[PDB]
Amino acid sequence: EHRDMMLVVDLSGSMAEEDMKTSNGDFVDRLTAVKQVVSDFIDQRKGDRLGLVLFGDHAYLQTPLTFDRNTVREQLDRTVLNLVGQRTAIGEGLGLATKTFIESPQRTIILLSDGANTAGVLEPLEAAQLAKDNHAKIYTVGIGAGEMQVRGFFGKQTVNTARDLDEDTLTKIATMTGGQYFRARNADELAEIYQTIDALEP
Amino acid sequence: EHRDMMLVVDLSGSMAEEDMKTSNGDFVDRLTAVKQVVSDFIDQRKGDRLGLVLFGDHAYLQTPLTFDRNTVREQLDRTVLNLVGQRTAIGEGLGLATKTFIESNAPQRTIILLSDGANTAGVLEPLEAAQLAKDNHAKIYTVGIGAGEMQVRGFFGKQTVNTARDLDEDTLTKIATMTGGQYFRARNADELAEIYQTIDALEP
Numbered sequence: 001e002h003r004d005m006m007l008v009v010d011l012s013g014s015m016a017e018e019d020m021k022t023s024n025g026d027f028v029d030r031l032t033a034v035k036q037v038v039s040d041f042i043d044q045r046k047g048d049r050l051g052l053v054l055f056g057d058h059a060y061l062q063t064p065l066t067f068d069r070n071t072v073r074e075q076l077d078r079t080v081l082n083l084v085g086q087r088t089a090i091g092e093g094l095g096l097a098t099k100t101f102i103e104s105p106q107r108t109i110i111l112l113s114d115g116a117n118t119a120g121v122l123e124p125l126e127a128a129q130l131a132k133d134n135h136a137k138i139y140t141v142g143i144g145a146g147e148m149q150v151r152g153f154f155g156k157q158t159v160n161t162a163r164d165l166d167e168d169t170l171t172k173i174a175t176m177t178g179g180q181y182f183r184a185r186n187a188d189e190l191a192e193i194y195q196t197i198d199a200l201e202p
Numbered sequence: 203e204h205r206d207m208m209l210v211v212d213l214s215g216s217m218a219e220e221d222m223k224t225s226n227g228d229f230v231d232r233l234t235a236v237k238q239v240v241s242d243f244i245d246q247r248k249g250d251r252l253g254l255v256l257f258g259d260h261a262y263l264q265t266p267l268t269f270d271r272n273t274v275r276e277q278l279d280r281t282v283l284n285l286v287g288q289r290t291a292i293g294e295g296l297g298l299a300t301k302t303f304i305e306s307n308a309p310q311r312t313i314i315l316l317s318d319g320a321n322t323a324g325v326l327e328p329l330e331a332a333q334l335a336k337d338n339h340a341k342i343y344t345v346g347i348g349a350g351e352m353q354v355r356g357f358f359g360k361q362t363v364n365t366a367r368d369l370d371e372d373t374l375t376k377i378a379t380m381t382g383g384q385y386f387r388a389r390n391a392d393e394l395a396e397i398y399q400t401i402d403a404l405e406p
């Protein structure tokens with residue numbers, strides 16, 4: 001599971017104080033010590049959304065809750081000192097963080113099938129309806145080579161590989177959710193569909 | 203920005219049929235072709251979460267959702283046929299995939315605030331602002347930062363400096379407590395390092 005985590009850090013002029021003692025015994029300023037530690041903290045949360053709020057006189061957000069943590073880390077790192085001023089708005093920062101939780105992904109289903117809905121508790125279209133409610137768009141891919149003509153001894157015999165394929169309801173599901181139905185009769189055809197689907201959702 | 207995409211794949215026994223012709227002209231079964239194409243598709247996606255639903259007689263969720271595409275690709279690779287029988291559950295497959303979007307609907311909210319100072323200036327008061335974070339289900343951890351009393355050699359002579367006179371700890375404590383978080387005081391870079399490690403351990 002994943003969490004959304006807001007980083008609200010202090011930029012007041014008092015941050016410039018060389019307070020912080022490292023193991024080898026050196027003193028460095030507060031902001032530098034923070035940059036170091038928090039950057040390592042950012043690298044640790046692989047699956048989570050992080051954002052950055054910087055505060056003082058006025059509180060402003062630096063990063064709006066991206067999954068991409070290299071930017072959040074980098075953005076924090078190029079931060080400087082004394083820009084904000086000598087006073088701190090703690091209530092401002094906490095509020096802006098909370099507000100940013102609210103102002104915050106696109107959803108897609110790719111359904112692949114060789115046949116009709118033979119066994120199920122809930123009907124396929126009622127699922128597509130529920131999918132629409134949750135903003136999920138469904139792309140549907142029917143798969144089978146269909147009818148093929150086999151030459152033989154006596155004369156023409158015809159074999160159809162996918163007649164179990166229900167293209168009617170597969171089309172409905174896609175159209176209902178605002179997606180498109182595709183039919184792949186071979187591997188080349190199949191790659192193009194998915195190559196196409198990638199392009200449709202950038 | 204970032205997308206959530208649920209892959210729903212048919213594993214019914216009919217998928218073992220080889221009607222799928224490849225580039226070079228030979229034939230291969232449907233699941234094999236699917237494994238190929240979908241795996242390649244997965245590599246192409248960037249910055250999106252992906253999950254895997256497999257169906258047949260019943261539908262089940264193979265991968266919840268993730269930024270690691272590799273695991274979705276491998277767990278696809280090792281899938282075999284005839285475990286789920288002949289029949290297909292398309293509704294169940296979609297309903298389960300749908301469901302998987304609703305667990306992404308409930309992220310736990312966490313704020314990490316650090317400060318050297320009291321809330322000297324601001325229109326919004328700290329404990330008001332804290333109250334709201336609780337209303338919005340946010341657990342905020344507070345970190346006080348400053349050495350405190352410190353012996354120092356000035357040019358003029360040896361001197362005792364308290365470097366965090368300003369630090370409001372009981373406001374910072376109230377904030378964390380009010381919202382269910384914890385308050386930490388960092389008197390050096392190592393305690394500071396340890397402090398964020400602890401917050402890592404508390405939120406898993």
Ligand SMILES: [Mg+2]
Nearest residue numbers: 115214216288
């Ligand atoms: Mg089937």
Ligand SMILES: [Mg+2]
Nearest residue numbers: 012014318319
């Ligand atoms: Mg200050």
